[PDB]
Amino acid sequence: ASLPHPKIVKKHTKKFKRHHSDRYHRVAENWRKQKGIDSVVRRRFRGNISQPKIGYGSNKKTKFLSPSGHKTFLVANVKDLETLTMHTKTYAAEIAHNISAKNRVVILARAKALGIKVTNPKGRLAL
Amino acid sequence: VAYGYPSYSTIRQLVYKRGFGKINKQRVPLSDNAIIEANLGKYGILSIDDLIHEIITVGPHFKQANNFLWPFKLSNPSGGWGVPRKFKHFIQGGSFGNREEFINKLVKSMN
Amino acid sequence: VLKKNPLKNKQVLLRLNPYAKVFAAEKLGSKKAEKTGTKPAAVFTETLKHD
Amino acid sequence: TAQQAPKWYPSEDVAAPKKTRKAVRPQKLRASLVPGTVLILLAGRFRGKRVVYLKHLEDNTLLVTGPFKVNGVPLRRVNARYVIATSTKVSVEGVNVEKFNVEYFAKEKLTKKEKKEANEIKAERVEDQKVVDKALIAEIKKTPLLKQYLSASFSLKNGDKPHMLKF
Amino acid sequence: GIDHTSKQHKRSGHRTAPKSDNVYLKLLVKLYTFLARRTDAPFNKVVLKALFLSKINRPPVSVSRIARALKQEGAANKTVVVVGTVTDDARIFEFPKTTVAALRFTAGARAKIVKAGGECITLDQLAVRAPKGQNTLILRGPRNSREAVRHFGMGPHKGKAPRILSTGRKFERARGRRRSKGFKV
RNA sequence: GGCGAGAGACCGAUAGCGAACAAGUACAGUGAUGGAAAGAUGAAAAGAACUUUGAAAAGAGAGUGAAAAAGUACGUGAAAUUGUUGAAAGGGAAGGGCAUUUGAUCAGACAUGGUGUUUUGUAUUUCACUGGCCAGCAUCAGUUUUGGUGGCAGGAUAAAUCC
RNA sequence: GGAUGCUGGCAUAAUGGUUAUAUGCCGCCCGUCUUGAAACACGGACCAAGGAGUCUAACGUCUAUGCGAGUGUUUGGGUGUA
RNA sequence: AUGAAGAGCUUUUAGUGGGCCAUUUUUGGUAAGCAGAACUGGCGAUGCGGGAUGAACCGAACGUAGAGUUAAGGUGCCGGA
RNA sequence: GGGUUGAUAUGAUGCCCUGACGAGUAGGCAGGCGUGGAGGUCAGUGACGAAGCCUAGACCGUAAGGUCGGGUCGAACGGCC
RNA sequence: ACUUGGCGGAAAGGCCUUGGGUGCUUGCUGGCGAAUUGCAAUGUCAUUUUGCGUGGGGAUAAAUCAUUUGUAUACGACUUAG
Numbered sequence A: 001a002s003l004p005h006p007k008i009v010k011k012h013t014k015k016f017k018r019h020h021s022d023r024y025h026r027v028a029e030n031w032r033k034q035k036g037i038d039s040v041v042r043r044r045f046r047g048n049i050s051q052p053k054i055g056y057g058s059n060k061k062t063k064f065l066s067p068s069g070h071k072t073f074l075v076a077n078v079k080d081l082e083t084l085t086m087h088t089k090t091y092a093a094e095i096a097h098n099i100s101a102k103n104r105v106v107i108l109a110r111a112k113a114l115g116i117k118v119t120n121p122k123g124r125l126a127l
Numbered sequence B: 001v002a003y004g005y006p007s008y009s010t011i012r013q014l015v016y017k018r019g020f021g022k023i024n025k026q027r028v029p030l031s032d033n034a035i036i037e038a039n040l041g042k043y044g045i046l047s048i049d050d051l052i053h054e055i056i057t058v059g060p061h062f063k064q065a066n067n068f069l070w071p072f073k074l075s076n077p078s079g080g081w082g083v084p085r086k087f088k089h090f091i092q093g094g095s096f097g098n099r100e101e102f103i104n105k106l107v108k109s110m111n
Numbered sequence C: 001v002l003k004k005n006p007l008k009n010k011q012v013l014l015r016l017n018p019y020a021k022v023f024a025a026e027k028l029g030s031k032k033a034e035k036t037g038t039k040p041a042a043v044f045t046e047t048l049k050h051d
Numbered sequence D: 001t002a003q004q005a006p007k008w009y010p011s012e013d014v015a016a017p018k019k020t021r022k023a024v025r026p027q028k029l030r031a032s033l034v035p036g037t038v039l040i041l042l043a044g045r046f047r048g049k050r051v052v053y054l055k056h057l058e059d060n061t062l063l064v065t066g067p068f069k070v071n072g073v074p075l076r077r078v079n080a081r082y083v084i085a086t087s088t089k090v091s092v093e094g095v096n097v098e099k100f101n102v103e104y105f106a107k108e109k110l111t112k113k114e115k116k117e118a119n120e121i122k123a124e125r126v127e128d129q130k131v132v133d134k135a136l137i138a139e140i141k142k143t144p145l146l147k148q149y150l151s152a153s154f155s156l157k158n159g160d161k162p163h164m165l166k167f
Numbered sequence E: 001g002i003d004h005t006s007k008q009h010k011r012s013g014h015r016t017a018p019k020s021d022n023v024y025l026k027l028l029v030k031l032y033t034f035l036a037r038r039t040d041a042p043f044n045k046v047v048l049k050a051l052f053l054s055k056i057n058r059p060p061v062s063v064s065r066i067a068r069a070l071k072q073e074g075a076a077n078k079t080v081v082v083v084g085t086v087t088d089d090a091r092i093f094e095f096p097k098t099t100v101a102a103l104r105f106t107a108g109a110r111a112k113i114v115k116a117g118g119e120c121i122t123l124d125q126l127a128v129r130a131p132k133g134q135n136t137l138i139l140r141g142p143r144n145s146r147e148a149v150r151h152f153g154m155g156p157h158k159g160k161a162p163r164i165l166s167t168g169r170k171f172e173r174a175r176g177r178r179r180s181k182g183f184k185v
Numbered sequence F: 001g002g003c004g005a006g007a008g009a010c011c012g013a014u015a016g017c018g019a020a021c022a023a024g025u026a027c028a029g030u031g032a033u034g035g036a037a038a039g040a041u042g043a044a045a046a047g048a049a050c051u052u053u054g055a056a057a058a059g060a061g062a063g064u065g066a067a068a069a070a071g072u073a074c075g076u077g078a079a080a081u082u083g084u085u086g087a088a089a090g091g092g093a094a095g096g097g098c099a100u101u102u103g104a105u106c107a108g109a110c111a112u113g114g115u116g117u118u119u120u121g122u123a124u125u126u127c128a129c130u131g132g133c134c135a136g137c138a139u140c141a142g143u144u145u146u147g148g149u150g151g152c153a154g155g156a157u158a159a160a161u162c163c
Numbered sequence G: 001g002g003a004u005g006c007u008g009g010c011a012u013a014a015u016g017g018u019u020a021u022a023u024g025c026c027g028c029c030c031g032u033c034u035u036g037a038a039a040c041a042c043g044g045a046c047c048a049a050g051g052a053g054u055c056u057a058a059c060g061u062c063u064a065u066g067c068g069a070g071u072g073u074u075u076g077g078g079u080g081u082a
Numbered sequence H: 001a002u003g004a005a006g007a008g009c010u011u012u013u014a015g016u017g018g019g020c021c022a023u024u025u026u027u028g029g030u031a032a033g034c035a036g037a038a039c040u041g042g043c044g045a046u047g048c049g050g051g052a053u054g055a056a057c058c059g060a061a062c063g064u065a066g067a068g069u070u071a072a073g074g075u076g077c078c079g080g081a
Numbered sequence I: 001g002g003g004u005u006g007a008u009a010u011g012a013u014g015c016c017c018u019g020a021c022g023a024g025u026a027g028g029c030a031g032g033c034g035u036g037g038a039g040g041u042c043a044g045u046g047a048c049g050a051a052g053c054c055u056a057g058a059c060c061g062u063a064a065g066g067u068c069g070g071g072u073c074g075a076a077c078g079g080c081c
Numbered sequence J: 001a002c003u004u005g006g007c008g009g010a011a012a013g014g015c016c017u018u019g020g021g022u023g024c025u026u027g028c029u030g031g032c033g034a035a036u037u038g039c040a041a042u043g044u045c046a047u048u049u050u051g052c053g054u055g056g057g058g059a060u061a062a063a064u065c066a067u068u069u070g071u072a073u074a075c076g077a078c079u080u081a082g
């Protein structure tokens, strides 16, 4: 159902991890640039981690697209969902985390009626 | 630099394979005679061949033709440089200087 | 959108040069020369062969 | 609202492809493949078997036969890049091969529901095989040891250097 | 690599898209960039560039300046264009019947120009009256008349208004300003 | 400052007055002086009757409670650090980067409009295919690599050989 | 003035992602002063939380806005849903 | 002659004001990986391939990737040839 | 450096075309991410379970970070200007 | 697969040989069969170990702790005994 798109290319599927997030627990994995005068990572010696830069950017045709080819749009109710009535081949709905189980039923029913794809049609389902 | 005296064959091959003009400060592939007629038709030049002619038979408008021509972006020689060591003179067994008529071979390997 | 190289792609060759059609028709890349009966003087040869 | 909106939505109308300039014109088979030539099959069920080349079909394939009475290879369709053409030659003048085409070999594709638990032949194909092979063995019987050469299977030995070999 | 002759990735150094967030000025820009794009007239480009300018590069233009400009030869029946504001000037006692196109008019300037029989015009009505700049006369105001320019280039033997809050005797009128006290600059 | 009032784009228990609590308290110092830490069960104690093992603390059950993954060491209950289980590796460190194997684990698309009634609930439907992953062949284009081969020119119109 | 056609298999953990491990090659500890740090130079055993160019008076250049030879209501008064 | 990659102009402000190395010129000194100057180029501020190893030497300067060709240096094995 | 307001549809800071370029300490500038609170709005989420916490489970983004699923939890909390 | 007689100790664990049995023999001539794995997909053929089963044979122990000894000994260990 998705709109035709090219092969999706990423150029770096590996998460850029902070230097020594593997060595110290106080050092979190969220990327920080090394600003040190003698940093091997800042100086880009062979054999060190890679630094994020703009050349790794994704093609503007395939940016923000999930592997299904849809752009994700968060919804909390049927009125927010109905904005994607005429955009089913481009945008897929994601029900927000804080939505209740009984309202997820309504959102999923209306999305099935309108032909809208839902990325998480299994949250808070009992059986 | 390495320099010498080029032949019609290598001039023609260069202008046809790596032929780029300076149009409004841009590097335009020639690919057609209309560009040349528009940017050099002032100076009697209509075709890539008349351009090659103004080059080889060094004419009144060589300056304007050669300035229109963007610098040729050549690859490295496909067979190599021939010597083991480049930065001696062509006479002393190197590559730089005037290799009067041996420049055609090098340029054809580089183009 | 793409630089097609003459010296291959006869179509682009002919787009740039219409003379390329008759160049091949007459085989001007293999033109024969008029024979000549010129012989150098004795001074040239003896100076060349001189020690 | 959890996510506000995009102010512009892309169009869902699909764009049409440009007119392509890639015409279909026929194959230029290599000069070693002539009808009647003996081929060695390199891949497939019948890999290593020697076989006869009869006809160049429309879908860039070769029509091929053992003959079936000799080595067990029936009237079949193979690809030129998966065979070696030998210098050995047979005369096929006298085989009415015009009947065969791409439609003669049609698989009658399988449906989604038919899943094989654990695990037939067309009499037309059987009879056409018996018709062609009888005209082929009549000519193979002339040259000596050729029926045996075809019944045998090809194999590379220790020392065989295919860049040096001749087939 | 490249042995670069110039500085790479350098901005032109010229303003585009005026950084004023005024929507009416943005609309004037939308109109005049279209006209500069399609009319082949240099007037449109001049006005478009002038609409980008800052306040100090858009000084006010006095009606007396306009009167000078119309006292030129062949300029009496012309349309004066001020990309900026027009201010009044009581130092004149006559004003002609001209038409004046400008962004803003002060109340006094508008009243003078109207009382003289003229009309005060906007740059959008100028666009329909003169899309290529027919019979126009662009006036710019004085830029170096500012106070900040007095101090630009301060140094010995330039004569360039030191930066000083309180003036009078005993504020920078001593050593360095008279031979009796050391030296004079 | 004292008494009495009303407010806040203030702080929110390592903050905010030192002090949200028996705080100028406990405590230290001969003394002048110095000066903390410390809030939260639950709506309600309904704060665990009773059985059993044990010297007892406690435990195991049972029971109260919406919840004992709320038991007065009580809201939530992070990390360091530790125990048990499971998984994997390990010849003087470990850890990291590129790449793939092996193992484990996992998302996505597989309906599609469509001839169509071989149709039941008579109009729901009867429905062959449709689009995704991986390849192969042919004909082309762009960039390049490696070969075979033909026609020409030049030189002492090769020098030689040969006569 | 940029690849189309034909065919086959699968339609699933098969491709692929993540993760651990193995293998080949590379890979010195961060921060800091310093011409020069992996340093036999200094700090750092670990973890959580806290933790460092702020506000003001007067100014300068630039920018934006309002009016414009004028400009600044808010010391104060009037009024008020204070 | 060649080239111009836009030319000219102004305002304001940061950091810096310990330097070091190589070729060549050169002063003191027996000399110094010493001290001090001149010209350029570099390190500092710079990773990459090579020089086994190295701030400066050779080559070459870096967005992310693919293919090809090469520089310097190399092709017994370690090690691609 | 240029093109493109034309009516009908969505974004003129938009879309599109063309060419070139991309090292970087101190330092400068720009565009963005995230936190506590304030005004406005989504008649936003929520005991049919908010926030927080754990999660070699998944998705988006160059990244800052954002989103989802599962577990735990119990009373509030977010998106956009 | 049996069977006879030898030789081989450097890590022999293999080499040679006798007798008959049995199977194949492409040395030669014939007959029948193969197909559909659909135009290729290693298109699965090897050896390494371990375990659980059936059925046919084969054999029916030691060490350590504890005690003890002092030719030994920080403790382990060692040496003795029962």
Ligand SMILES: [Mg+2]
Pocket (backbone or CB within 6 Å): A020, A021, A022, A023, A024, A025, A026, A027, A028, A029
């Ligand atoms: Mg960490």
Ligand SMILES: [Mg+2]
Pocket (backbone or CB within 6 Å): A037, A038
């Ligand atoms: Mg450094």
Ligand SMILES: [Mg+2]
Pocket (backbone or CB within 6 Å): none
């Ligand atoms: Mg090569």
Ligand SMILES: [Mg+2]
Pocket (backbone or CB within 6 Å): B083, B084, B085, B086
């Ligand atoms: Mg070399």
Ligand SMILES: [Mg+2]
Pocket (backbone or CB within 6 Å): C001, C002
């Ligand atoms: Mg292009």
Ligand SMILES: [Mg+2]
Pocket (backbone or CB within 6 Å): E001, E002, I022
């Ligand atoms: Mg570059």
Ligand SMILES: [Mg+2]
Pocket (backbone or CB within 6 Å): F067
């Ligand atoms: Mg609870």
Ligand SMILES: [Mg+2]
Pocket (backbone or CB within 6 Å): F070, F075
């Ligand atoms: Mg609780």
Ligand SMILES: [Mg+2]
Pocket (backbone or CB within 6 Å): F077
């Ligand atoms: Mg608790």
Ligand SMILES: [Mg+2]
Pocket (backbone or CB within 6 Å): none
């Ligand atoms: Mg822990």
Ligand SMILES: [Mg+2]
Pocket (backbone or CB within 6 Å): none
């Ligand atoms: Mg090709």
Ligand SMILES: [Mg+2]
Pocket (backbone or CB within 6 Å): none
């Ligand atoms: Mg080729």
Ligand SMILES: [Mg+2]
Pocket (backbone or CB within 6 Å): none
């Ligand atoms: Mg010749």
Ligand SMILES: [Mg+2]
Pocket (backbone or CB within 6 Å): none
């Ligand atoms: Mg996998």
Ligand SMILES: [Mg+2]
Pocket (backbone or CB within 6 Å): none
């Ligand atoms: Mg894989």
Ligand SMILES: [Mg+2]
Pocket (backbone or CB within 6 Å): none
């Ligand atoms: Mg894996």
